[PDB]
Paper text:
The plasma membrane Na+/H+ exchanger 1 (NHE1, SLC9A1) is a central regulator of cellular pH and volume, and thus is important for cell proliferation, survival, and motility in mammalian tissues. Recently, it was shown that CN recruits regulators, inhibitors, and substrates using two short linear motifs (SLiMs), the PxIxIT and the LxVP motifs. We show that the two canonical CN-specific SLiMs, a previously identified PxIxIT motif and a newly discovered LxVP motif, contribute to NHE1 binding of CN.
First, we used ITC to show that NHE1 residues I680-S723 constitute the minimal NHE1 CN-binding domain (NHE1 residues I680-S723, hereafter referred to as NHE1ctΔ92; KD = 21 ± 2 nM). Next, we determined the three-dimensional structure of the NHE1ctΔ92:CN triple complex to a resolution of 1.9 Å (CN: CNA1–370, CNB16–170). Namely, the NHE1 PxIxIT motif forms a β-strand that hydrogen bonds with β14 of CNA, extending one of its central β-sheets. Specifically, in the NHE1-CN complex, both NHE1 PxIxIT residues T718 and D720 form hydrogen bonds with CNA N330. The interaction of NHE1 with CN at the LxVP-binding pocket, which buries 560 Å2 of SASA, is essentially identical to those observed between CN and other LxVP motifs. Despite the observation that most of the NHE1 residues linking the LxVP and PxIxIT motifs exhibited line broadening, no electron density was detected for residues H689-E712.
Numbering used by the authors:
A (entry chain B): 15 to 170
B (entry chain A): 10 to 370
C (entry chain C): 681 to 688, 713 to 723
């Protein structure tokens, strides 16, 4: 990306890296007060953590932040949103993880029974190839027209 | 850790994906298998489109041959609005009795507001096919194109079936009779009286096979209400513009009493207005000693918020037996049949962006 | 907003109350 942006991200990474280990832990992200009440923090961290070691190193940090660039296209934004739901990273949103991620967002505003019912119906109505899970293509068929990608922009 | 593929809330049964075929819904003699249908629809199961259309058109053909004004002997159980509350319809038949051995009259408003309207239509139409001379269906004001495209029935059809099925329902609804003369004592309608209806013969002469007009006697039968101050009239006018509905009229207690006396009737049985108890008995006619008007409302916990009882009226052995019932659980739908992705994605994009802004400061 | 929300001769008359 842009050179001055790389420099600013280095300085910010170091400030978040409270124990100066070279990698960002969940506790270190959660030290930010405004992240403590955001129910999708652990999902975003998991997506940044491409090697699955539980922490975000600087390479992961830069590539993760880059997906929110103004120059990123619609598919890039919508695929990040897709990965929010796809907890197991197999490329398909399955019933169990769709419930779990929605449960994180809704908390007690819906009962588990109600949430499972609408999850079931979305799986059935959105599954077009019959494998019982939602691919990225099936996902975009449903949400592609909502223009949420326009909102997922961050200035580094 | 909870599985990411298997379902979390396993006590909730996964709805069936298979669509029932004609052989599965119609027995060897062409009669609907209403036990199969009831069990499948209670699971939110669907029919094949051709099978749904067969139910709708076969039921329409029976309705098409009926009179504007049905002649229904007692005993009969009279039922008011259902409004797509299929799981309460199931309770209604438990309370009123099985259609296998119970005569029924429904006063309309089968669809809209509740999100199981097409299941209500398919099951009641199947019962009408199976019990053509013991189960009766009148038209309510929601059984039309105007209201079902404004409310959610049309959208419900397009989500679960097709617009073709919606269109078939609209042509079937045009066949619905408008009124019933019950036990030669009661005029039964959805809404009520009309300035242009002075005799039962005025009902027989209507042309009902059409979308309800914006005004006139067919409109008034489906749309009219008693005055707010019914029975306590300073309002000396028999019919006044119905400002609640935006069409048709309020009718007064003198208006109703005059109609009853002129036509030798005991009472008007109608629906159309929610009641906390599921019914309302209005002021007795001074000449009969019997309530001049009765409202029956069969949708408990209307709109999931009213917290009202529902009732049906079982008229049998010269007894008018009000049977109340409470609401029953039903599966959940987001408003307007919205899917969870459309519902949640705005929040996801909002909160992930918010985190990134805060992470970067 | 910290959580996702849901969008917006004479017949006698007898009574059998709800069970
Ligand atoms: Ca660290
Ligand atoms: Ca990592
Ligand atoms: Ca997955
Ligand atoms: Ca699929
Ligand atoms: Fe109604
Ligand atoms: Na249409
Ligand atoms: Zn009505």
């Amino acid at each position: 990306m842009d050179a001055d942006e790389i420099k600013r991200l280095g300085k910010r990474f170091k400030k978040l890296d409270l124990d100066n280990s070279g990698s960002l832990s969940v506790e270190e992200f959660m030290s930010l007060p405004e992240l403590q009440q955001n129910p999708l923090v652990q999902r975003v961290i998991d997506i940044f953590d491409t090697d699955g070691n539980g922490e975000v190193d600087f390479k992961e940090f830069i590539e993760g932040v880059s997906q929110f660039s103004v120059k990123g296209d619609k598919e890039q934004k919508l695929r990040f949103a897709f990965r929010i739901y796809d907890m197991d990273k197999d490329g398909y949103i399955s019933n169990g993880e769709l419930f779990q991620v929605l449960k994180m967002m809704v908390g007690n505003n819906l009962k588990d029974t109600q949430l499972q019912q609408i999850v079931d119906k979305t799986i059935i109505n959105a599954d077009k190839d019959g494998d019982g899970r939602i691919s990225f293509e099936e996902f975009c068929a449903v949400v592609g027209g909502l223009d949420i990608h326009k909102k997922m922009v961050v200035d580094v | 850790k909870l599985s990411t593929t298997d379902r979390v809330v396993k006590a909730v049964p996964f709805p069936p994906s298979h669509r029932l075929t004609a052989k599965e819904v119609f027995d060897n003699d062409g009669k609907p298998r209403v036990d199969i249908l009831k069990a499948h629809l209670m699971k939110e199961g669907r029919l094949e489109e051709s099978v749904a259309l067969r139910i709708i058109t076969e039921g329409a053909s029976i309705l098409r041959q009926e009179k504007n004004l049905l002649d229904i002997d007692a005993p009969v159980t009279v039922c008011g609005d259902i409004h797509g509350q299929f799981f309460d319809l199931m309770k209604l038949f438990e309370v009123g009795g099985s259609p296998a051995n119970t005569r029924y009259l429904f006063l309309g408003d089968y669809v809209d507001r509740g999100y199981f309207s097409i299941e209500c239509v398919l099951y009641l139409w199947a019962l009408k096919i199976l019990y053509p001379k013991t189960l009766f269906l009148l038209r309510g004001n929601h059984e039309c194109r105007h209201l079902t495209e404004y409310f959610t029935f049309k959208q419900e059809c397009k989500i679960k079936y097709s617009e073709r099925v919606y269109d078939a329902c609209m042509d079937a609804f045009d066949c619905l009779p408008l009124a019933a003369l019950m036990n030669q004592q009661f005029l039964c309608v959805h809404g009520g009286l009309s300035p242009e209806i002075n005799t039962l013969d005025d009902i027989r002469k209507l042309d009902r096979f059409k979308e309800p007009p914006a005004y006139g006697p067919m409109c008034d039968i489906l749309w009219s209400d008693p005055l707010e101050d019914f029975g306590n009239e300073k309002t000396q006018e028999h019919f006044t513009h119905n400002t609640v509905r935006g069409c048709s009229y309020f009718y007064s207690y003198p208006a109703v009493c005059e109609f009853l006396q002129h036509n030798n009737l005991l009472s008007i049985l109608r629906a159309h207005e929610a009641q906390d108890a599921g019914y309302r008995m209005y002021r007795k006619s001074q000449t009969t000693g019997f309530p001049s008007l009765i409202t029956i409302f069969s949708a408990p916990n209307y709109l999931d918020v009213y917290n009202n009882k529902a009732a049906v009226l079982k008229y049998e052995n010269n007894v008018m037996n009000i049977r109340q019932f409470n609401c029953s659980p039903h599966p959940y739908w987001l408003p307007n049949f919205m899917d969870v992705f459309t519902w949640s994605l705005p929040f996801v994009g909002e909160k992930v962006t918010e985190m990134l802004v805060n992470v970067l400061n | 907003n910290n959580y996702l929300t849901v969008p917006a001769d004479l017949p006698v008359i007898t009574i059998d109350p709800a069970s």
